[PDB]
Nucleic acid binder design. Structure first.
Length: 183
DNA sequence: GCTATAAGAGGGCA
DNA sequence: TGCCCTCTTATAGC
């Protein structure tokens, strides 16, 4: 399952759910101390909980975005709590169409990488402009995932809606990273 | 903090 | 249209 012997650590999960009822954002920002509401800056009530440590963006439409969780289960668990906070605030909040929208993972191959050489041999997938951003942007097509590769051997993998895409994307890149190890 | 990456949701504007 | 608005998170050089 993990031939490299390295398993990317999940760092951030973004999920969405439909509370299925219109929400009064001022009433929420007023009643719940946990919330922040700034209409002129952003159309959402920003609310946070300690466990699982997450941040929710709550919209008048009843739609909700949940960010910050370390796993898919934690994200859904956090979403459910926010849904309950809203219910208790006096809204008929449900939990419709919960969905994991993005998974961000990271790992360390423990060896430096020759980024320019990797970029050159994979021009169609790479974007490496160190003066702009020190990491190489690798847009993997299968699976459709974006990896940020640094000289240190540290790797960020983002864009996955399923964790196996994070894993597979890493496994695909591993042999390439090795080929371009900095001696 | 800023630079870059993915993804969601919405109001607002060119 | 079509993108920025906000927010999260790892990464690292500014």
């Amino acid at each position: 399952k993990h031939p490299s012997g390295i398993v990317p650590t999940l760092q951030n999960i973004v999920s969405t759910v439909n509370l299925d009822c219109k929400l009064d954002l001022k009433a929420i920002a007023l009643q719940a101390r946990n919330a922040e509401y700034n209409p002129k800056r952003f159309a959402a009530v920003i609310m946070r909980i300690r466990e699982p440590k997450t941040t929710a963006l709550i919209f008048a439409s009843g739609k909700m975005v949940c960010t910050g969780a370390k796993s898919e289960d934690f994200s859904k668990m956090a979403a459910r709590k926010y849904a309950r906070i809203v219910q208790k605030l006096g809204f008929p909040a449900k939990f419709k169409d919960f969905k994991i929208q993005n998974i961000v993972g990271s790992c360390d191959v423990k060896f430096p990488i020759r980024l320019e050489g990797l970029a050159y041999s994979h021009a169609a997938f790479s974007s490496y402009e160190p003066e702009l951003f020190p990491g190489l942007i690798y847009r993997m097509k299968v699976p459709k995932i974006v990896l940020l590769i640094f000289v240190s051997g540290k790797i960020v993998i983002t864009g996955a809606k399923m964790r196996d895409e994070t894993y597979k994307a890493f496994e695909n890149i591993y042999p390439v990273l090795s080929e371009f190890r900095k001696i």
